[model samples]
Target chain A: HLLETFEMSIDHQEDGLVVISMPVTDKVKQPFGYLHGGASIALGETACSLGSANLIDTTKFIPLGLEMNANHIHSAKDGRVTATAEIIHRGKSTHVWDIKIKNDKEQLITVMRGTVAIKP
Target chain B: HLLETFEMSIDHQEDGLVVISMPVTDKVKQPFGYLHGGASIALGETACSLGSANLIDTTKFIPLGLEMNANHIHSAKDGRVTATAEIIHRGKSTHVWDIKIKNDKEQLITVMRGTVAIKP
Candidate 1:
């Protein structure tokens, strides 16, 4: 229930990267019906933990997510699926993410990468 | 059951990166379970599709896995779960993965990332 109480809809960003736009209904599908590779790795680890928690400094930093991986190519019987988080190696203690889940003609429907460990 | 018939145990590699070592049983847990984050994203997309299918050249190449992402922080309940696949950006079409699911004292339970799209 993180990410500001779950209301993701960012859709686009630059430089450090961050593009989240979810909407796959059926409560995120599963049971082999479709969509739900753990809800696309919980929306690509909540867009790489909210783009690495907005790049640190939350009063002294605290990012978590010490590991992650995924790859569920092609499997979405209904609609929506779009996740994109990129920021590979933002080190100081670790912060590497490269998520990507596409559908809606963009194809490629899942692929993630993560490692966020910066707590001080 | 791809990757040379699911034998996996190539503990390490260099250059393009690849580290496969699977073990956890219970036939890959679930049902209020543990160690079933889609079987650690299918052992991190089968170690990023056999490390990008050994970097192309398989008679013209064919490395699938379009996308992926995972982040199951903690919750193991029992034993084994040590996946590791790294190769972030071997682009030409696409190939990005950064998996890590550790347990045997190494801590980190789950975290994944992937993206392999090379058809030719």
Candidate 2:
């Protein structure tokens, strides 16, 4: 439901890489008409969880976001932003990912590092 | 709109301190039915922004999230979480905050540090 509200979609997925995109619609915008930092972090976390899911056993364990660090490098006024997540560390109990969000011109919008806890 | 969707409300507000609360409803849950880390971060950011607003001149500058660091210490199944944000560093161009989200029993669920950029 959150994804639907944010208009987020998983464009591509692999073992250690996942690409997610979200439109800069009003539903995800701040009062200043810019992309909210929280929305970008949510997009990055989704990419991390989806990428982790592809590499883990979903039936036995689930990925939960344990910690997140994000730097809002730039703000987007319009157009869509894409988040690409790559594995930083994949362990039995924790999976770390470095996610980067870029605008249409491939400019960095946000950089996020997420730690997912593998819980049964 | 985002706050409305998440059912977030500002419970208390004063100089350098703000309290925001959100229910653990279906809209703010993960696929496994626990509190979503992204939702908690969003709530924390809202508190930071609102708290910064109280200290700045609304007619001249706006507070925008620049960096966010969050630790999801615990998860709640079916209870409301209240986020308390206190001023950590107030500079001419940046406002830093420490936000803690706790459950009804005074159990800490998430710890966050947010930095907001004062922009004209």
Candidate 3:
């Protein structure tokens, strides 16, 4: 998983679902030292991919991210932030996931969604 | 400024605006080797920050990213992609930027928007 190199860890996983957490550190930080929005996206996209990979067959088809969207409204600058992603839809050729990121205080850091296209 | 390490360059700078270009490299690519969606957001955010930092006084007001959204529909592997950001609104204590990313062929790779909250 790309998340590992990005300083992220999977906190939980079950079936086709996953909960990942990332440390707010300089390795994934912006110039201002807060978590980079791109890092949030990396975490978000990784979570989305985890679900799609679990539900699809890797033997003949690979789940590829076609599109994604995110809203970053707050920061967990001093603590670990975690994202819980759940599949909204899983079809023959596509999968959709909604991800919610929350800080230690339970404040929503970002709300995001991702769409994956299964490629043969 | 952070673009230096990311291998991104500024193509244009005027007033408080800038257009930045990034090469599609493994340094910022996802595991699948397509340009990482997060990398696109990184460039978009950096471009948006350049605008706000230019229009505001860093000694007094530092602009912080409050929110942003992006759609990743295309990839530009091995080519260069550029982002042009325009101010949608610049309020007394807030700013909005619309960013359009395109590959070498001028194909729109990603459309993104950002909002910044000025902190004193």
Candidate 4:
């Protein structure tokens, strides 16, 4: 939902999966030239929120971010990285999405998991 | 280090804990009017980085964030949030900081933990 803040774009979503991408820019970088971990985490959770929102009836329920965590493994200075969020668990009240962000080399840069609680 | 980006200010650090606060402005909010989780994460991680830097000698090693996770216990609308980072573990290669964010009402809003690896 807030992906626009970080310039997140939907690349594809099918087969119960979501793929989003964001460019590495100073707008999303912390210090020096690396993509900010917080920006990556936002993309992860926001992608999960968008995916989760599409899975439910928006008229009857609202998605609220519950908790999210990320492990920073690599750093990026330029170009764009893609993130894939796949459903790991789906419940009536809670949904869990596992997101993996990779650089152009397909190297694992940031591993994240997002838990969203639906208000029905 | 990049606290100015999010308008994070050092409130105090005299008691061995670094306390930083950020205003809840629209610039830092997501689509829902509440404080953006990403901004808060940035504040948390930035605070931890500054706190970690204070404990190290800063000549031989540079601090690099390794892993960080945040729990959104509560949401902030228009006031401000203060985050405090207390060193939980300090090792030669890594340092762990526990950060607790509170709202203007002095209520716990986010529970965060950050780990930094010192690059020599």
DockQ winner: 2
- The DockQ-derived docking category for candidate 1 is incorrect
**CA error at residue B23 for candidate 4, angstroms:** 2.0
lDDT of 3 by residue, A1-120 (tens): 245556678888886688999778766666665777767777888888777888877788887777777777787676888989999888888898999988889998888888888889
> Arrange candidates by TM-score, highest first: which order?
2, 4, 3, 1
* Model 1, span B32-98: residue lDDT tens: 3455454566566667777887887868867776667666677564556667788979988888879
Cα deviation at A104, candidate 4, in Å, is 2.5
Between candidates 3 and 4, the TM-score winner: 4
- Return model 4's CA RMSD, one decimal: 2.2
Interface RMSD of 3: 3.0
**Candidate 3 structure lDDT:** 0.79
lDDT of 2 at A54: 88
Clashes found in each candidate (C-alpha, N, C closer than 3 A): 20, 0, 0, 0
* Candidate 3 root-mean-square deviation in Å: 2.6
Task: Provide the RMSD of all predictions against the true structure, rounded to 1 decimal.
Answer: 15.7, 1.3, 2.6, 2.2
- Which DockQ value does candidate 3 get? 0.41
- TM-score to native of every candidate shown: 0.31, 0.95, 0.84, 0.90
Give the Å shift of residue B14 in candidate 3.
2.2
DockQ ranking, best first: 2, 4, 3, 1
- What's model 1's TM-score? 0.31
- The digit string of per-residue lDDT tens for model 4 on A1-120 reads 346656778999974489999888777776654787777777787678778888888889977778888899988777898999999998899999999999887888899988888887
Docking class of 4: medium
**Candidate 2: global Cα-lDDT?**
0.89
lDDT of 3 by residue, B2-120 (tens): 36546788888776467999888766666666777767777888888878888888888877777777777677777898989888998998899999989999988889888878888
Q: In model 4 chain A, where is the ten-residue run with the lowest total lDDT? A: A1-10
Off by over 4 Å in 3: A1-5, B1-5
